[PDB]
Design a protein around this ligand. Structure first.
Ligand SMILES: O=C(O)c1cc(C(F)(F)F)ccc1Nc1ccc2[nH]c3ccccc3c2c1
Length: 269
C-alpha cells in the first residue's frame, strides 16, 4: 500500500499509518454518497477532526491523527478527576464544533468519549461521525431509543450532556446494556416522560403505555460536585423534549462559560 501501519481500534478498523511518500502520520479508517462525503473534506473547524482524503476501490477515509481520546484521558484521570477549568474548556470547545456542523445541517449521531480526540495544546475535536448511514448505547438520546425516524441536532446535545456529566462525576451517567435498560436508566433518573414534559411522547413508535412510571430525582443528586451554573446547563442539555433541549449556540451563551479558559492537559503519550 502507500502506508505503513499500526492498529489503534462500527464502520471498520482504524490504523495509525505513515504516508510512504510524505512522511505524514495519519489515521486510516477502512470501511467494510461519495459526492457528499467529499463535501466534508472542504468543511473544516478547529474542533472537528480533519478529513484529508476519501478513497474508494472498500472505502478508505484518511484523517489527521491525534494521539489520545477523551475516554483514555478520563480513565487516566480517574483517581483525581479532570480539573473543572479543563472540563469547561472541553465542553465549550465541543459545543463550538457542534454549533459549526449543526449550522451546516450535519449531525454527528454517535458522540462518545472514545470519539473525542485531544492534543497536548488543550484542544479537543469531534471525530468518528455516524454519517455512513457490541454497541455502546450510554449516550443515545431518548427519542432515538423510542424509535423516532427523524433525528434532529438535539440528539448530539443529549450525548454531550451525558459526556459532561461523566467528566464531572467520573462515572457514566446512563450505562445501559440494552435499549430498554438504557431507556429505563434514563427514566429512573429524570422521571418517566409524559405528555406534560414531552408532548407527543406517547405516540412514538416504541413507546409503551406499560412503561413503569418513575418519579424524577434531583440534579443535585445527579452531578453532585457541580455548581448551579453547570447543573442548570446540564438540565437544559438533558430535556426530554428535543424542542426544549438547548441548542449548541445557546449553550455557548450560558453563564457557565463566563469564566472559561483554555488549560493545557497533562498527557502521557
Ligand atoms: O468520522 C467519520 O468516521 C466520518 C465518516 C464519514 C463516512 F460517511 F464516509 F463514513 C464521513 C465523515 C466522517 N467524519 C467527518 C470528518 C470531517 C468533517 N468535517 C465536517 C464539517 C461539518 C460537518 C461534518 C464534518 C465532518 C465529519
Amino acid at each position: 500500500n502507500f502506508q505503513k501501519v499500526e492498529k489503534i481500534g462500527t464502520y471498520g478498523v482504524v490504523y495509525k499509518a505513515r504516508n510512504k511518500l510524505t512522511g505524514e502520520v495519519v489515521a486510516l479508517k477502512k470501511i467494510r454518497a461519495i459526492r457528499e462525503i467529499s463535501l466534508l473534506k472542504e468543511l473544516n473547524h478547529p474542533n472537528i477532526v480533519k478529513l484529508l482524503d476519501v478513497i474508494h476501490t472498500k472505502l478508505y477515509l484518511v484523517f489527521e491523527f491525534l494521539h489520545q481520546d477523551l475516554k483514555k484521558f478520563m480513565d487516566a484521570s480517574a483517581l483525581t478527576g479532570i480539573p473543572l477549568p479543563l472540563i469547561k474548556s472541553y465542553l465549550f470547545q465541543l459545543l463550538q464544533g457542534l454549533a459549526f456542523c449543526h449550522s451546516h445541517r450535519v449531525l454527528h449521531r454517535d458522540l462518545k468519549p472514545q470519539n473525542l480526540l485531544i492534543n497536548t495544546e488543550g484542544a479537543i475535536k469531534l471525530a468518528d461521525f455516524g454519517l455512513a448511514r457490541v454497541v455502546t448505547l450510554w449516550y443515545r438520546a431518548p427519542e432515538i431509543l423510542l424509535g423516532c425516524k427523524y433525528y434532529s441536532t438535539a440528539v448530539d446535545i443529549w450525548s454531550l450532556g451525558c459526556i459532561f456529566a461523566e467528566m464531572v462525576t467520573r462515572r457514566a451517567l446512563f450505562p445501559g446494556d440494552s435499549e430498554i435498560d438504557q431507556l429505563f436508566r434514563i427514566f429512573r433518573t429524570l422521571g418517566t416522560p409524559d405528555e406534560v414534559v414531552w408532548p407527543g411522547v406517547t405516540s412514538m413508535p416504541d413507546y409503551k403505555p406499560s412503561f413503569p412510571k418513575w418519579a424524577r430525582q434531583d440534579f443535585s443528586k445527579v452531578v453532585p460536585p457541580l455548581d448551579e451554573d453547570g447543573r442548570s446547563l446540564l438540565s437544559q442539555m438533558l430535556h426530554y423534549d428535543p424542542n426544549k433541549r438547548i441548542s449548541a449556540k445557546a449553550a455557548l451563551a450560558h453563564p457557565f462559560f463566563q469564566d472559561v479558559t483554555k488549560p493545557v492537559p497533562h498527557l502521557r503519550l
